[PDB]
Design an enzyme around this catalytic site. Structure first.
Site, PDB file in Angstrom:
ATOM      1  NE  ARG A  77      -2.668  -1.147   3.400  1.00 33.16           N
ATOM      2  CZ  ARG A  77      -2.023  -0.488   4.353  1.00 33.16           C
ATOM      3  NH1 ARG A  77      -1.871   0.830   4.302  1.00 33.16           N
ATOM      4  NH2 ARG A  77      -1.530  -1.165   5.389  1.00 33.16           N
ATOM      5  CE1 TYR A 216       0.699  -6.300  -2.108  1.00 34.14           C
ATOM      6  CE2 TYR A 216       1.957  -7.176  -3.964  1.00 34.14           C
ATOM      7  CZ  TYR A 216       1.579  -7.236  -2.632  1.00 34.14           C
ATOM      8  OH  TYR A 216       2.100  -8.245  -1.846  1.00 34.14           O
ATOM      9  N   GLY A 217      -2.787  -5.601  -4.153  1.00 32.81           N
ATOM     10  CA  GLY A 217      -3.529  -5.708  -2.911  1.00 32.81           C
ATOM     11  C   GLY A 217      -4.547  -4.632  -2.595  1.00 32.81           C
ATOM     12  CE  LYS A 225      -6.867  -3.576   4.633  1.00 31.52           C
ATOM     13  NZ  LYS A 225      -7.277  -4.045   5.961  1.00 31.52           N
ATOM     14  CG  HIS A 245      -7.484  -3.112  10.286  1.00 36.42           C
ATOM     15  ND1 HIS A 245      -6.181  -2.662  10.361  1.00 36.42           N
ATOM     16  CD2 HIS A 245      -7.470  -4.158   9.424  1.00 36.42           C
ATOM     17  CE1 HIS A 245      -5.410  -3.411   9.593  1.00 36.42           C
ATOM     18  NE2 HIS A 245      -6.165  -4.326   9.013  1.00 36.42           N
ATOM     19  CB  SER A 267      -1.212  -3.648   8.226  1.00 37.73           C
ATOM     20  OG  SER A 267      -2.329  -2.795   8.059  1.00 37.73           O
ATOM     21  CB  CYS A 269       0.544  -6.250  14.159  1.00 41.68           C
ATOM     22  SG  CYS A 269       1.676  -4.918  13.654  1.00 41.68           S
ATOM     23  CG  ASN A 273       0.070 -15.887  13.018  1.00 42.09           C
ATOM     24  OD1 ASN A 273      -0.130 -16.531  11.991  1.00 42.09           O
ATOM     25  ND2 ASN A 273       1.277 -15.415  13.357  1.00 42.09           N
ATOM     26  CG  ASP A 294      -8.090  -7.303   6.893  1.00 47.92           C
ATOM     27  OD1 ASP A 294      -7.218  -6.845   7.651  1.00 47.92           O
ATOM     28  OD2 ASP A 294      -8.381  -6.766   5.795  1.00 47.92           O
ATOM     29  NE  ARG A 395      -0.041  -8.863   2.232  1.00 49.42           N
ATOM     30  CZ  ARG A 395      -0.594  -8.341   3.318  1.00 49.42           C
ATOM     31  NH1 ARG A 395      -1.676  -8.878   3.870  1.00 49.42           N
ATOM     32  NH2 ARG A 395      -0.044  -7.258   3.866  1.00 49.42           N
ATOM     33  N   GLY A 524       0.762 -19.907  19.498  1.00 48.65           N
ATOM     34  CA  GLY A 524      -0.225 -20.714  20.198  1.00 48.65           C
ATOM     35  C   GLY A 524      -0.315 -20.408  21.681  1.00 48.65           C
TER      36      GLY A 524
HETATM   37  O1  LIG Z   1      -2.203  -3.937   5.017  1.00 46.45           O
HETATM   38  C1  LIG Z   1      -3.266  -4.420   5.500  1.00 46.45           C
HETATM   39  O2  LIG Z   1      -3.844  -4.113   6.557  1.00 46.45           O
HETATM   40  C2  LIG Z   1      -3.923  -5.581   4.687  1.00 46.45           C
HETATM   41  O3  LIG Z   1      -4.892  -6.210   5.091  1.00 46.45           O
HETATM   42  C3  LIG Z   1      -3.292  -5.850   3.345  1.00 46.45           C
HETATM   43  S1  LIG Z   1      -3.901  -4.800   2.006  1.00 46.45           S
HETATM   44  O4  LIG Z   1      -5.230  -5.325   1.670  1.00 46.45           O
HETATM   45  O5  LIG Z   1      -3.922  -3.424   2.516  1.00 46.45           O
HETATM   46  O6  LIG Z   1      -2.966  -4.997   0.882  1.00 46.45           O
HETATM   47 MN   LIG Z   2      -5.668  -5.368   7.112  1.00 49.37          MN
END
Ligand SMILES: O=C(O)C(=O)CS(=O)(=O)O
Ligand SMILES: [Mn+2]
Length: 615
Positions: A77, A216-217, A225, A245, A267, A269, A273, A294, A395, A524
């Site tokens: 981004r 990209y993304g 987003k 978010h 993002s 972070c 997981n 997300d 990704r 975990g």
């Molecule tokens: O950067 C983020 O918070 C994402 O979820 C990836 S993107 O969709 O912004 O590329």
């Molecule tokens: Mn995100």
């Protein structure tokens, strides 16, 4: 005008007119309407293979999966090129980049005039939220990137069924995207078209989204987003709901009680997981299930509860670091039907990224790879130069239904009730492992003032601490101070029902020791913190009052199966007076920047924390 090839199932006159107007402006060679079928997906994937954008992976090792590699200028981004063009600058606020709308419209019109010469315009209809449900909203993205079309098929509910919902009169979010690389007659294209000049622009009053120059993304998948956070936050501010978010998970304890938790981490972070967490040793009978990793759309109900849905249909997750220790559900998710972007290619036609060696014999790196730039890679090269085989922001794109831990209500439009919120930045110092806010106002304070070290998810210097309120610094659609007030007002509406409000926690998995390694093992083992939160939700968990809120004592957590001493616990839970006095001064600088419409409650909370530190 140009033949639009409008399918017979498109009954919306205003939509067709809009496409005709955009085709007149962008001037593509041809127009193609995406129907969303699996057959079309395979056709567009084969088209991407022919162009060199996609490499098909070995079917025996990675069924129905593809690898794409991008231009090194187009890997993340670009926050400095992302704009909120509200009528008044005060409704963008200090955390956003603003420009007078008529002035931005005059800037972009030459850029989009003829941007798609030599290319096809793909019409990508999509629904954020389940198709035809009361909480869903429809967008149309016009794009000249087939990479966008196939990724949108996974990440949204895409295709012809959208037009049944739209009907003749339904409204829609208008999205226009171009890679900004028009082709001359007979000109040779490149494998990843893009432009060094980029704009990602939002007009809140019209709900328009315009994206130029990046494929990209989050710059180019405009439902994610631009719509489901930036535009949707404006809608929820006016209509009484939130766009956040946040991951959403379900957790069930051995007694069979099930709770749900929403966590806002910045993002890259740890949202993916945590949303797929597997309970470690010592937690027999517990289960964790995923609703989303997300984006969350949340609104209160008459019963005093807060209901959340995940509006996306798949995962667009950071790849490096994923292995059977850190995220096995994600490892199983990407066994097939996945698009990988900017990871490495093995000699046998599979993919590899940093972190996978943890599952390899002798934990050893592969002998040879082709890295994301097409260059030869070897462990010797990596030892001597530190070259990354997979880009740090690489990704995977994969359907939610590939996730073995997917919750049964993941796509239920009624939502799940949220029992606790979690906020957490990436902080090498200062912030303890877990703290429960004493009140809703103090929780909003902790969310408003959180800091986090920058990551590869956006361009720029990584590892720098910055304020990232609610993990929404790159995504808030209006003035951040007005958003703080929205959260305060939401709490008052919930309390007026007589209900007990959801609790709010601050966590930090990322404290570092003197060698720069993490003191808390995490992954975990984060279940041990989650289980204390559950105890607290039930009214059965003990805690101690600290400066910033209530924290568990060592004997309040379950350590069965983990060798982690009371001394190591003290290190990651001690409140250091000097570090927090410095931290509160950084809060004051934030409040100076967000002075306009800043709720008075934040300054009052700050003064109470200042008193507790000086005691
Ligand atoms: O950067 C983020 O918070 C994402 O979820 C990836 S993107 O969709 O912004 O590329
Ligand atoms: Mn995100």
């Amino acid at each position: 005008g140009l033949n639009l090839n409008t399918p017979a199932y498109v009954k919306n006159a205003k939509l067709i007119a809009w496409v005709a107007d955009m085709v007149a402006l962008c001037k593509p060679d041809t127009v193609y309407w995406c129907d969303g079928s699996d057959a079309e997906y395979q056709r567009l994937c084969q088209q991407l293979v022919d162009a060199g954008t996609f490499k098909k992976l070995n079917e025996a090792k990675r069924p129905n999966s593809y690898l794409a590699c991008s231009d090194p200028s187009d890997v993340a981004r670009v926050e400095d090129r992302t704009y909120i063009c509200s009528a008044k600058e005060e409704n963008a606020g200090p955390t956003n980049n603003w420009m007078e709308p008529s002035e931005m419209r005059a800037t972009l019109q030459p850029l989009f005039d003829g941007c798609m010469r030599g290319r096809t315009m793909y019409v990508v209809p999509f629904s954020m939220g389940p198709l035809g449900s009361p909480i869903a909203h429809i967008g149309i993205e016009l794009s000249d990137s087939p990479y966008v079309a196939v990724n949108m098929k996974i990440m949204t509910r895409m295709g012809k069924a959208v037009f049944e919902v739209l009907g003749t009169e339904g409204d829609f979010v208008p999205c226009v995207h171009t890679v900004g690389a028009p082709l001359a007659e007979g000109e040779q294209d490149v494998t990843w078209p893009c432009n060094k000049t980029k704009y990602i622009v939002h007009y809140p009053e019209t709900r328009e989204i315009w994206s130029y120059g990046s494929g990209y993304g989050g710059n180019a998948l405009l439902g994610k987003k631009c719509f489901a956070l930036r535009i949707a936050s404006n809608m929820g501010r006016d209509e009484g709901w939130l766009a956040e978010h946040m991951l959403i998970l379900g957790v069930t304890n051995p007694e069979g009680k099930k709770y749900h938790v929403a966590a806002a981490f910045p993002s890259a972070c740890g949202k993916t997981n945590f949303s797929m967490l597997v309970p470690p040793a010592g937690f027999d009978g517990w289960s964790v299930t995923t609703i989303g990793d997300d984006i969350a759309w949340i609104k209160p109900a008459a019963d005093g509860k807060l209901y959340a849905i995940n509006p996306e249909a798949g995962y667009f997750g950071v790849a490096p670091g994923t292995n059977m220790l850190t995220n096995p559900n994600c490892m199983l998710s990407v066994r097939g039907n996945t698009i990988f972007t900017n990871v490495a290619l093995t000699d046998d036609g599979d993919v590899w990224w940093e972190g996978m060696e943890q599952d390899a014999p002798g934990k050893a790196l592969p002998d040879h790879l082709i890295d994301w730039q097409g260059k030869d890679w070897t462990p010797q090269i990596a030892k001597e130069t530190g070259a990354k085989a997979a880009h740090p922001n690489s990704r995977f794109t994969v359907a939610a239904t590939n996730n073995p831990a997917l919750d049964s209500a993941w796509d239920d439009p009624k939502g799940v009730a949220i029992d606790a919120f979690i906020f957490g930045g990436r902080r090498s110092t200062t912030v303890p492992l877990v703290t429960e806010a004493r009140s809703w106002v103090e929780g909003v304070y902790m969310a408003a003032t959180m800091g986090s070290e920058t990551t590869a998810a956006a361009t720029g210097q990584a590892g720098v601490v910055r304020r990232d309120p609610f993990a929404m610094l790159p995504f808030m659609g209006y003035n951040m101070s007005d958003y703080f007030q929205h959260w305060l007002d939401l709490g008052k509406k919930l309390a007026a029902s007589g209900a007990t409000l959801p609790k709010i926690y601050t966590t930090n998995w990322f404290r570092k020791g003197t060698d720069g390694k993490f003191v808390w093992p995490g992954y975990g083992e984060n279940m041990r913190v989650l289980a204390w939160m559950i105890d607290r939700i039930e009214g059965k968990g003990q805690g101690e009052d600290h400066v910033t809120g209530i924290s568990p004592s060592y004997e309040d957590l379950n350590w069965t199966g983990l060798d982690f001493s009371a001394d190591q616990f003290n290190t990651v839970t001690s409140i250091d007076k000097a570090a927090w006095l410095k931290e509160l001064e950084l809060h004051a600088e934030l409040f100076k920047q967000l002075e306009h419409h800043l709720p008075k409650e934040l300054g009052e909370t700050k003064a109470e924390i200042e008193r507790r530190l000086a005691a």
